[PDB]
Design a protein around this ligand. Sequence first.
Ligand SMILES: O=C(CCCCCCCCCO)NCCCC#Cc1cn([C@H]2C[C@H](O)[C@@H](COP(=O)(O)OP(=O)(O)OP(=O)(O)O)O2)c(=O)[nH]c1=O
Ligand SMILES: [Mg+2]
Ligand SMILES: [Mg+2]
Ligand SMILES: [Mg+2]
Ligand SMILES: [Mg+2]
Ligand SMILES: [Mg+2]
Ligand SMILES: [Mg+2]
Length: 539
Amino acid sequence: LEEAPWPPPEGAFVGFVLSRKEPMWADLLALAAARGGRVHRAPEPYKALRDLKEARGLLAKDLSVLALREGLGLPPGDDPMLLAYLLDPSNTTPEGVARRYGGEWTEEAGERAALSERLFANLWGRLEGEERLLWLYREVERPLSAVLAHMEATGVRLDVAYLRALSLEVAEEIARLEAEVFRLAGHPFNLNSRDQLERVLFDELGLPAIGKTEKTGKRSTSAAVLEALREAHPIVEKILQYRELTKLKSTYIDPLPDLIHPRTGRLHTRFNQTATATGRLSSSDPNLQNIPVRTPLGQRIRRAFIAEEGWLLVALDYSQIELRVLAHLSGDENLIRVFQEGRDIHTETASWMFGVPREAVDPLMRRAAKTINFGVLYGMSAHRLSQELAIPYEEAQAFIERYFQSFPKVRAWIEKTLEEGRRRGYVETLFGRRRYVPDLEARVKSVREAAERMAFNMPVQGTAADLMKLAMVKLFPRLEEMGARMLLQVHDELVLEAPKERAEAVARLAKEVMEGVYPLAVPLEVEVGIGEDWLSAKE
DNA sequence: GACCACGGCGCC
DNA sequence: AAAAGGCGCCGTGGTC
Ligand SMILES: O=C(CCCCCCCCCO)NCCCC#Cc1cn([C@H]2C[C@H](O)[C@@H](COP(=O)(O)OP(=O)(O)OP(=O)(O)O)O2)c(=O)[nH]c1=O
Ligand SMILES: [Mg+2]
Ligand SMILES: [Mg+2]
Ligand SMILES: [Mg+2]
Ligand SMILES: [Mg+2]
Ligand SMILES: [Mg+2]
Ligand SMILES: [Mg+2]
């Protein structure tokens, strides 16, 4: 390309280099643009940002997030990553996409701009005739990138002082647990080392091995194995308690307060748009899609996520979402009827599990039932189910039979999906998002059957993901108009922040947008809560 | 200081 | 651990 002075003309493709991967934390080291046989390199990258109308190119959203951080309204536009991801969701990195579709991801901005331009050309050509993938690009992925940029640049408020205090309390309880473990072992060792713990449990103490690890075949010390050993030795329960506390402390309580941004005073995640095999988003640096909520300490941590002074959090969560999607995809009359009548399969399963009437089912019990309901749907074994429920194998086997007997057209949809997947090489969501699964034709049964579970899960999980993405794209401009903010997405949940005076109105509108996004053969229902913290907003 | 593979585990 | 699926981050162990 012919070198030309900055600035580029409108429509140019951008290339940029960051000091680190996270756009909220990165220094913009270089900026360039390419169009019409020319490359334009910016002498001063930050000032040069002001010249662009949109970020068009590889990782466009990251540049937009940095621009928004700097107080510039620079929206992301075309991004070859999104085109590539729609063609094949194994396309997740610019290194891989570049190699596959015509170039090399280097560390120079001008080369990145040139690459973006030519990749766009080639990938756009590949989507010619792919009407359904093109619809996803234009109606979902491209506009969603703009929404995600705003979410990333906004961040969420965290009660740092509360977490710092919590750390000190948890540290004292961890000390009590570890001291007991070492007493019971008869000697100290590194309790954080599963290799050292394996030797203590299975060699030094008398305990029976229950299972083996996947890659290296060591005797497992997983929570599932320890659960099976609860009655065998007092050290086991102490280890389980130690694990719960150290997991929460090392992953959330200690690291999060150190990640507050100096300018915004908030915690900023990244929402990765080309990261999963099914079309789900992922969240990283830090992951805010796995904040604890199940246990009492986990709940205390979730309460640290709070609204800005004068604002409230609004949390919205699709009810039984993958079951509703399954009803639509499979067309099972019984399942469709369940949702037309307003029943709750999670509450029903929970009633059976704990042997209590539906009115007696508490939230933790219902959570337990969700694990069981989705476990069974996506192929859990009777053995595993029997162990997790602590019921005889025969009882677990029976539950699985009746589960599918109740909804007969589900297994037929699974078989049809797998057969088409074998022929075409891919399975697809309602909207035509594809996942390639070549191991459907594997000659090794365990491999093939694992592939089958991945394959029939994808249309369900992916359709639910598509629906949420479409809802975000529709909702965002409405929130902007009301002065509200979209903060987080957690798969089938959104967390918004609204001025107190408008929170009730925002909650109502968001619920309606989400429920009416793309009507199915069954109603979509959305549960909504409002609160000063994330935990209180979900109750 | 960094990378990796692994086991393990937090969420959906 | 066991025939649930989908993620990212932890510390360990080993290395570079
Ligand atoms: O926390 C637990 C275990 C509970 C404790 C175990 C027993 C304790 C008993 C104590 C008695 O005193 N389970 C986790 C629950 C959260 C979950 C989940 C999953 C979700 N999905 C998919 C399917 C689901 O539709 C979608 C969104 O998840 P949710 O929003 O949580 O589920 P939902 O939309 O189906 O139901 P809901 O929103 O109406 O609650 O993600 C899965 O595929 N697998 C899961 O395990
Ligand atoms: Mg839900
Ligand atoms: Mg949810
Ligand atoms: Mg209104
Ligand atoms: Mg190891
Ligand atoms: Mg792993
Ligand atoms: Mg699981």
